[PDB]
Amino acid sequence: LRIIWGTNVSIQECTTNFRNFLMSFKYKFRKILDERDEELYYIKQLNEMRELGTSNLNLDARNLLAYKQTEDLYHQLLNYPQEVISIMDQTIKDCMVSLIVDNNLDYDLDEIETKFYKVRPYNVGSCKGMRELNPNDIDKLINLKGLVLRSTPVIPDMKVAFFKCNVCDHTMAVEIDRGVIQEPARCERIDCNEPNSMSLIHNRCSFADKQVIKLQETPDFVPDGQTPHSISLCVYDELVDSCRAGDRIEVTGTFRSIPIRANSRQRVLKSLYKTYVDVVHVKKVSDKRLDVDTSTIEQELMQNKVDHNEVEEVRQITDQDLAKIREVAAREDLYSLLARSIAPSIYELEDVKKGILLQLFGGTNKTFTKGGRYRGDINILLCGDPSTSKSQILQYVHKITPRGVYTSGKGSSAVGLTAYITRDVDTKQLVLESGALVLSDGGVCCIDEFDKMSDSTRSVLHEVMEQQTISIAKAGIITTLNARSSILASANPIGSRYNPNLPVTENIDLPPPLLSRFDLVYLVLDKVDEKNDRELAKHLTNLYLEDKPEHISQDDVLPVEFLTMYISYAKEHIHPIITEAAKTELVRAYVGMRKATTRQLESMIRLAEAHAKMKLKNVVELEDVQEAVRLIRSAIKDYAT
Amino acid sequence: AAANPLYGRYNPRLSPLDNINLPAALLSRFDILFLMLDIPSRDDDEKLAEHVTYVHMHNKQPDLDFTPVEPSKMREYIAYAKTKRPVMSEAVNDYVVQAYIRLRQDSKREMDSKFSFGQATPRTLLGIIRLSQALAKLRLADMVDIDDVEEALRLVRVSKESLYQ
Ligand SMILES: Nc1ncnc2c1ncn2[C@@H]1O[C@H](COP(=O)(O)OP(=O)(O)O)[C@@H](O)[C@H]1O
Ligand SMILES: [Zn+2]
Known part of the structure; x- marks a missing residue:
C-alpha cells in the first residue's frame, strides 16, 4: 500500500480502477441513476479522437457516480483534482497505447509516445x-x-x-x-x-x-x-x-x-x-437556449481549429435528430405548431408569438464584399392594454436567447447602453467595458417601459434600429462597433388602458418616424368578452390544479429541447433567396399601403424570408409573402380604422 | 403603500380615476386598493374617542373578552403557515371563473360612468387566487375551499363600498 501525504489516493490502485472503468462502461446511469442499445461507450469516443488530433477528453463526471466500481473515485477527483487529474494524464496515454498494441496499425506510435493527453471534468453538482x-x-x-x-x-x-x-x-x-x-x-x-x-x-x-x-x-x-x-x-x-x-x-x-x-x-x-x-x-x-449566429462568429470557428482546441462552439446533432426534423417539417401546421409551443402557458396571441418566432429565425444576412451589409431581423413593439403577455414574453425570449440584457425604463441610459470607461479597482487602471447593446451583439435586446425611457436616451436606438451599429467619439476611444442586436420593445399608450376614439399614431405617444422604423408593431387591445376570458381563466387555474404543471403536455406541443434544435439548425443552414417572381405580389402590397415608408418593404423581405427559414426553403415562393403581409396588417388591426 | 388624493381629502364630484392621480396601469398592479376615507358621524366617532382616550389614559388596550396576541408568537405562527402550499378544488375553480366573468362583464359593460373605476383583469383573478391561497394557509389547510374565495371577493369589493358613505 502506497499513499500520498495528506491524501487518500493510491496511484496504482486508482490507475487500475480507472482502466477497469475505461474498458467497461455502457450507459449504466440510464439503468441505475434514476427512473430513466449502445456499447463500449467511451472506446468509440477514444478511437474517435486519435485520428482527429483533438487531444482533449471531455468527461461526463457522473458516469462514475452511477457506475458500480468508481464511486470510490468521484469524491477523490472532486476533492483532489490537481493530483487526480495528474494521474489521468498518464493512465489515458497508457490506455491509448493498449489500443495500439492490440491493433495492427500504422505509425501512430511516433508522436503519441511524446504528445500529452488531458481531461476536462465538467458535469459536477450545483x-x-x-x-x-x-x-x-x-x-x-x-x-x-x-x-x-x-x-x-x-x-x-x-x-x-x-x-x-x-x-x-x-x-x-x-x-x-x-x-x-x-x-x-x-x-x-x-x-x-x-x-x-x-x-x-x-x-x-x-x-x-x-x-x-x-x-x-x-x-x-x-x-x-x-x-x-x-x-x-x-x-x-x-x-x-x-x-x-x-x-x-x-x-x-x-x-x-x-x-x-x-x-x-x-x-x-x-x-x-x-x-x-x-x-x-x-x-x-446548452440544450435549452439556441446557438450563437454562425455567420457572425465565423472568425472564431476557424480559430478553434487554428488554435487546436475542440471546446465546442455549436450544438452537435445526430442523423436520428435531423431525420426527425425533416419529417416534422413536412407537416401542414408547423406554422402554428411552433407558434403554440413557443409559449405553452400563454393564451391565444398567436399573431404575436408567430412574428416573434420569425424574429428568432432572423431571416437572411448579406454583404457586398467590401462596401455594404444588410441583415435579417425584425424590430418589434408591443402596445395596448396592461394585464397581458408583454412582460412574460420578454422573459421567455430572454431565457431562450443566448444573449441579451433586459433593459428597463429610466434605469437605462446612454453611458450604459453603449460602452463606458471605468477604473478597474483590482489593478487601478482605466479599462473599457461593453455596454448593454454591445454585449447584445447578436440574439435579442429586450426593452421594456419603452416610452418611459427619456428623450435623450432614445436617440441611440434611433440609429441602431436598422443601421445595427454604434459610432463613438469620446475620450480614449474613437470607433464604430458592431451592434447586431434585434430589438424588442414593450410599450403602453398615452394616459392608460386604451382609447379607440383617438388615432393610434397619437395614442401610442411615440413619434411617427421611430414608430415607422419599427418593422412590426403589435396592437394587443383587450376588447373583453365571455367565451374568451372564460377559456383563459380555465387555462390559468389549471396551473394551480397540480402544484407543478407537469400535465401541461396536454394540447400537444413540441419539447423545447427539440424546438431549439430545429431553430438552431434552420438559422444556421439555410440562406433563403428572394426569387425574382416574388416581386410582383410584393410591390403591390407596398403600394397598397401608400394610397408608411420603405421600412415596411425592407421589413416584409426580412419577415417573408424568415417564413422560408421556417419550412427550410432555400428559395422564397409566391405564397410566403401572402402570410407575411397579412400579419403586418392584422398586427395593427388595419381593417378596423 | 400609503397615498393621499389630489386635495388631501376626496372630492365626491370627481370620479376616482380623476380623484386619484395615479395611472391605472400602475394601479392595476395593486391587487387591492383601500379607499380608506373618513366621513363625520354622530355615533361612530364616540367609540373612537373612547379608545384613544383610554389608550392615552394608559398604555393598556380595551377590556374586551379578548387578548391582543404578542407579536413574536404571531411571527412564529406565520412562519409555520408560510410552509403550506395549498391546492385549488375543481368546485371552486369553476366558481372563481364564473364570478370573474360576472365581475368583468359588470365592470366593463355597466361600470364605466360616474363612480365607476378601472377594469377587471386577469391580474385581479390571480389576486383572488393568491388571496384564496393565503386564507387556506391561515387555516393551515392543504386545500382551498369554495368557502375561501367567497371571502376573498368580499375584501376586493368592500375596499370601495366606503365610497358610497
Ligand atoms: N392571455 C393571457 N395568457 C396567459 N397569461 C396571461 C394572459 N393575460 C395575462 N396573463 C398573466 O398576467 C401576467 C402578465 O402581467 P403583464 O400584463 O405582463 O404586465 P403588463 O400589464 O405590464 O404587461 C402574467 O403572469 C400572465 O401569466
Ligand atoms: Zn561566465
Whole structure:
C-alpha cells in the first residue's frame, strides 16, 4: 500500500480502477441513476479522437457516480483534482497505447509516445456560486453558471526561463518550479566561476498564454439579502478566446486562494486572501437556449481549429435528430405548431408569438464584399392594454436567447447602453467595458417601459434600429462597433388602458418616424368578452390544479429541447433567396399601403424570408409573402380604422 | 403603500380615476386598493374617542373578552403557515371563473360612468387566487375551499363600498 501525504489516493490502485472503468462502461446511469442499445461507450469516443488530433477528453463526471466500481473515485477527483487529474494524464496515454498494441496499425506510435493527453471534468453538482464556498472548499472542483462582463488581454507567463552569461560563452535554462525561478549565482562553475555576473534574457524564454475573465455569477438560488458578485477567474492556454462578453455559460475549475502584495515597495502580504477560479472546462452551450449566429462568429470557428482546441462552439446533432426534423417539417401546421409551443402557458396571441418566432429565425444576412451589409431581423413593439403577455414574453425570449440584457425604463441610459470607461479597482487602471447593446451583439435586446425611457436616451436606438451599429467619439476611444442586436420593445399608450376614439399614431405617444422604423408593431387591445376570458381563466387555474404543471403536455406541443434544435439548425443552414417572381405580389402590397415608408418593404423581405427559414426553403415562393403581409396588417388591426 | 388624493381629502364630484392621480396601469398592479376615507358621524366617532382616550389614559388596550396576541408568537405562527402550499378544488375553480366573468362583464359593460373605476383583469383573478391561497394557509389547510374565495371577493369589493358613505 502506497499513499500520498495528506491524501487518500493510491496511484496504482486508482490507475487500475480507472482502466477497469475505461474498458467497461455502457450507459449504466440510464439503468441505475434514476427512473430513466449502445456499447463500449467511451472506446468509440477514444478511437474517435486519435485520428482527429483533438487531444482533449471531455468527461461526463457522473458516469462514475452511477457506475458500480468508481464511486470510490468521484469524491477523490472532486476533492483532489490537481493530483487526480495528474494521474489521468498518464493512465489515458497508457490506455491509448493498449489500443495500439492490440491493433495492427500504422505509425501512430511516433508522436503519441511524446504528445500529452488531458481531461476536462465538467458535469459536477450545483453550488451557490461564490457564497457557499467556505474555506473548507479551497482547492476543490467547482462549477459556476453565469455570464462574462469583461476579459483582459493575454498575459505572458514564464514556463522556461533563460540565462545569458556575460562572459565565457555558455548560457543556461531552468524550468520553473511551483512559482519560482531559482537563478544560479555560480556561473556554472565547471566552465569557470565568476561570482555574480550572469544575465536573464527575456526574449529567449518560453511562455504560457494566460488570460483573466470577469464573471457575473447567477446562481439557481440566491439567499434573501444577496447582490450580484463579479468573480474574477483565470483561464490558461487552449481556452484563451474560448468565451467572451455576453456569453451565458457553465464553467468549471478549481476554487483557489492567493495573497496580494500590499504595495509595489516591499513583500508584505495581506492576510485576508483573495479568491478566484482556475478554469479547467467551460460548457459554451446548452440544450435549452439556441446557438450563437454562425455567420457572425465565423472568425472564431476557424480559430478553434487554428488554435487546436475542440471546446465546442455549436450544438452537435445526430442523423436520428435531423431525420426527425425533416419529417416534422413536412407537416401542414408547423406554422402554428411552433407558434403554440413557443409559449405553452400563454393564451391565444398567436399573431404575436408567430412574428416573434420569425424574429428568432432572423431571416437572411448579406454583404457586398467590401462596401455594404444588410441583415435579417425584425424590430418589434408591443402596445395596448396592461394585464397581458408583454412582460412574460420578454422573459421567455430572454431565457431562450443566448444573449441579451433586459433593459428597463429610466434605469437605462446612454453611458450604459453603449460602452463606458471605468477604473478597474483590482489593478487601478482605466479599462473599457461593453455596454448593454454591445454585449447584445447578436440574439435579442429586450426593452421594456419603452416610452418611459427619456428623450435623450432614445436617440441611440434611433440609429441602431436598422443601421445595427454604434459610432463613438469620446475620450480614449474613437470607433464604430458592431451592434447586431434585434430589438424588442414593450410599450403602453398615452394616459392608460386604451382609447379607440383617438388615432393610434397619437395614442401610442411615440413619434411617427421611430414608430415607422419599427418593422412590426403589435396592437394587443383587450376588447373583453365571455367565451374568451372564460377559456383563459380555465387555462390559468389549471396551473394551480397540480402544484407543478407537469400535465401541461396536454394540447400537444413540441419539447423545447427539440424546438431549439430545429431553430438552431434552420438559422444556421439555410440562406433563403428572394426569387425574382416574388416581386410582383410584393410591390403591390407596398403600394397598397401608400394610397408608411420603405421600412415596411425592407421589413416584409426580412419577415417573408424568415417564413422560408421556417419550412427550410432555400428559395422564397409566391405564397410566403401572402402570410407575411397579412400579419403586418392584422398586427395593427388595419381593417378596423 | 400609503397615498393621499389630489386635495388631501376626496372630492365626491370627481370620479376616482380623476380623484386619484395615479395611472391605472400602475394601479392595476395593486391587487387591492383601500379607499380608506373618513366621513363625520354622530355615533361612530364616540367609540373612537373612547379608545384613544383610554389608550392615552394608559398604555393598556380595551377590556374586551379578548387578548391582543404578542407579536413574536404571531411571527412564529406565520412562519409555520408560510410552509403550506395549498391546492385549488375543481368546485371552486369553476366558481372563481364564473364570478370573474360576472365581475368583468359588470365592470366593463355597466361600470364605466360616474363612480365607476378601472377594469377587471386577469391580474385581479390571480389576486383572488393568491388571496384564496393565503386564507387556506391561515387555516393551515392543504386545500382551498369554495368557502375561501367567497371571502376573498368580499375584501376586493368592500375596499370601495366606503365610497358610497
Ligand atoms: N392571455 C393571457 N395568457 C396567459 N397569461 C396571461 C394572459 N393575460 C395575462 N396573463 C398573466 O398576467 C401576467 C402578465 O402581467 P403583464 O400584463 O405582463 O404586465 P403588463 O400589464 O405590464 O404587461 C402574467 O403572469 C400572465 O401569466
Ligand atoms: Zn561566465
